[PDB]
């Protein structure tokens, strides 16, 4: 089962965020069995297939800001890091992990502008 440590993030304008998305890993991760999808309101952020990614399919509004952290991935955490968080980044993020079965979770991100 895919689990999330939390399903709501409130993150500061201009900061970096890491959204987590956990799945069961045994002694070692098998890339040949793993697909990860991160999506946000019809925008494709990460489309990871057995180790393979193609920047060309990443939605323009996440270019150079959004990546799947590979060290975490190796621990069963398909963590999406988004740098320089924008107000437009607020919304519902969806992760799908396929790894000995497919499951998914939804995560709300809110962006605050403290003063």
């Amino acid at each position: 089962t895919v689990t999330v440590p939390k399903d709501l993030y409130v993150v500061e304008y201009g900061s970096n965020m890491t959204i987590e998305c956990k799945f069961p890993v045994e002694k070692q991760l098998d890339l040949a069995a793993l697909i990860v999808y991160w999506e946000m309101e019809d925008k494709n952020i990460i489309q990871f297939v057995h180790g393979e990614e193609d920047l060309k399919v990443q939605h323009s509004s996440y270019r150079q800001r959004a990546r799947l952290l590979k060290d975490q991935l190796s621990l069963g955490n398909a963590a999406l890091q988004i740098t320089d968080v924008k107000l437009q980044d607020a919304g519902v993020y969806r992760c799908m992990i396929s790894y000995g079965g497919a499951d998914y979770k939804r995560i709300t991100v809110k962006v605050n502008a403290p003063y």
Binding site: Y37, E39, N44, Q47, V57, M96, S98
Partner: peptide, 15 residues
């Protein structure tokens, strides 16, 4: 889905 070079849509659709 699941060609990494083609847009997907939620869930496991082609975009």
């Amino acid at each position: 889905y699941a060609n990494p070079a083609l847009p997907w849509a939620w869930x496991x659709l082609c975009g």
